[PDB]
Amino acid sequence: PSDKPVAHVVANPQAEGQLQWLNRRANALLANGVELRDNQLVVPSEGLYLIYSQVLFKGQGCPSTHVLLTHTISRIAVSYQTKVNLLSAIKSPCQRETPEGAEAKPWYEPIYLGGVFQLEKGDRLSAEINRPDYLDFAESGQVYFGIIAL
Amino acid sequence: DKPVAHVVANPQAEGQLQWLNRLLANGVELRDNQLVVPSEGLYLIYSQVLFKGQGCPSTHVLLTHTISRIAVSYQTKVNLLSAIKSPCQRETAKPWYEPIYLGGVFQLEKGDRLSAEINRPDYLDFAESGQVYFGIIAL
Amino acid sequence: ACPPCLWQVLCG
Ligand SMILES: *Cc1c(C)c(C*)c(C)c(C*)c1C
């Protein structure tokens, strides 16, 4: 008997080149009012929430130094249909291009985001990335998005 | 009232990540380096580890950290949260540092066992105190 | 001992 709204969704590994969130695969959940609509989490009541997510990027070799990975969680209000970033990070996994002389070493970069925010009833929350081509869901527990009311 | 636990690395232990015993209250126990959940319900689970290395010997270096669950019903290990990191950019002596932090909310069953593990305990860093840890909190 | 982290708000 936990009456607090809460949610934990995971990437659909069958979706190719897309960050698609899924509910209730084993070890995922939507509880006490929280809903997944249009790939967003919909908040059922006004209040303070911890919001979090992780993504994992993987690349085979580094052909340009200028690769840029981003991950951001944003919020849209029912009152204003306008998007505001709550948490965002940026990462550049490459410091030197592969000297072709060398050959195809994989790199891995995780980004975890989390924090506490006042949200309003009906707010919609998105966790998005710039490069779904570089996403890695070869395994469970690598990519997820959740919230917990305080 | 609500079960909770926060364990920390034993810095004495060489070549494994050993969580320190008896911190952990209200039914939660540490058995066989795992946290044992005393009641079914929703839990926040979390952990952090810190890796430290001298120079980049070869870019082949991979760090992993993962939290898994074994259901008393399932008796099979399932990953809940997991991350991978490769620190050795522009690899061959400059020291490097890499943290990995994991956390999220899960429905667990009474008797479930939770593990927080890594692949390279040789690269663990205990120089920053209280910063390698593993915990849970019932909601 | 107990440094700041993203979840601490839920444990007091
Ligand atoms: C001491 C401590 C720390 C460092 C964290 C991150 C959490 C989540 C909790 C509950 C506690 C007690």
Numbering used by the authors:
A (entry chain A): 8 to 157
B (entry chain B): 10 to 31, 36 to 105, 111 to 157
C (entry chain E): 1 to 12
Direct quotes from the study:
The proinflammatory cytokine tumor necrosis factor-alpha (TNFα) is a critical mediator of normal inflammatory responses but its overproduction can cause acute and chronic tissue damage. Here we have investigated the potential of macrocyclic peptides as another alternative class of TNF binders. Said system has allowed the discovery of M21, a high-affinity binder to TNFα capable of inducing dissociation of the trimeric state of the pro-inflammatory cytokine TNFα, a relevant clinical target, to an inactive dimeric form.
In order to better understand the effects of the M21 bicyclic peptide on TNFα structure and function we determined a structure of the peptide-cytokine complex by X-ray crystallography at 2.95 Å resolution. The asymmetric unit of the crystal consists of 2 copies of a TNFα—M21 bicycle complex at a ratio of 2 : 1. The structure shows the M21 peptide bound to a dimer of TNFα subunits (A and B) interacting with residues from both A and B and with an average interface area of TNFα and M21 of 231 Å2 (compared to 398 Å2 for the TNFα subunit interface). M21 is bound at a hydrophobic epitope adjacent but non-overlapping with the TNF (R1) receptor binding site but overlapping with the SPD304 binding site. The flat surface of the M21 bicycle formed by the organic core and W7 packs against the core of the A subunit involving H15, Y59 and Y151. The side-chains of the M21 loop 2 (residues L6, V9 and L10) make contacts with the B subunit. The only hydrogen bond observed between bicycle and TNFα (in both copies of the complex) is formed between amine group of W7 in loop2 and the hydroxyl group of Y119 side-chain in TNFα subunit B. No other intermolecular hydrogen bonds or salt bridges are observed, suggesting that the high-affinity interaction is largely driven by hydrophobic/van der Waals interactions and shape complementarity. The disassembly of TNFα trimers by M21 might occur either by induced TNFα trimer dissociation or by stabilization of a transient dimeric form. The latter is more consistent with the slow time-dependent effect of M21 action and with the inability of M21h to bind the stably trimeric transmembrane form of TNFα (tmTNF).
